[PDB]
Structure 1
Amino acid sequence: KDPKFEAAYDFPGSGSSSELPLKKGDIVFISRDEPSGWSLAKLLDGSKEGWVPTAYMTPYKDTRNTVPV
């Protein structure tokens, strides 16, 4: 995996084991991005993995602040 993405849309899925259902605002790792328009997502705690619509995933950024750590 390793880059983080945020869900910009709910993805309820269709109840397929191959999917990873997400709510808007969910943050996941993405390991793959396929031309079919699907991305392979993994929950941050490693506990589940599955495909999600690439369309729905946007690069995660923690805060809008330019405050340094």
Structure 2
Amino acid sequence: DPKFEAAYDFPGSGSSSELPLKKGDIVFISRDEPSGWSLAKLLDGSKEGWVPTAYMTPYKDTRNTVPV
């Protein structure tokens, strides 16, 4: 799966269907839905929950800018 970066805080409502984020957090994304929500998983796989698709931006580290 691809990795996405939280561009905004998402403290959410408290729901266990929600994955609360801080800015700069990095997650996997398995599903986007038309409601505007994305199904995010932490990198260690410990929690799974929906997040605002809008907050989620492709992760680019500056160590990724080399061919191999």
User: Same-fold call, TM > 0.5?
Assistant: yes
Offset at residue 65 of structure 1 (A): 7.7
Offset at residue 63 of structure 1 (A): 1.7
Output the aligned Cα RMSD. 1.6
| Structure 1 pair 66–55 and aligned structure 2 pair: CA distance change class (3 A) | same
The aligned runs of 1:1-69 (5 Å cut-off) are 2-63=1-62, 66=65
Offset at residue 62 of structure 1 (A): 1.4
Scaled by the length of structure 2, the TM-score of the pair is: 0.91
Offset at residue 64 of structure 1 (A): 7.3
Offset at residue 66 of structure 1 (A): 4.3
Scaled by the length of structure 1, the TM-score of the pair is: 0.90
Runs of 4+ more than 6 Å apart = none
Mean CA deviation greater in 25-34 or 57-66 = 57-66
CA-to-partner distance for each residue in 1:5-57, whole Å, 9 max, x for gaps?
A: 00000000100000000000000000000000000000000000000000000
Q: Where do 5+ consecutive residues of structure 2 fail to align?
A: none
| Structure 1 pair 68–55 and aligned structure 2 pair: CA distance change class (3 A) | same
Mean CA deviation greater in 56-65 or 3-12 = 56-65
Q: How many residues align?
A: 68
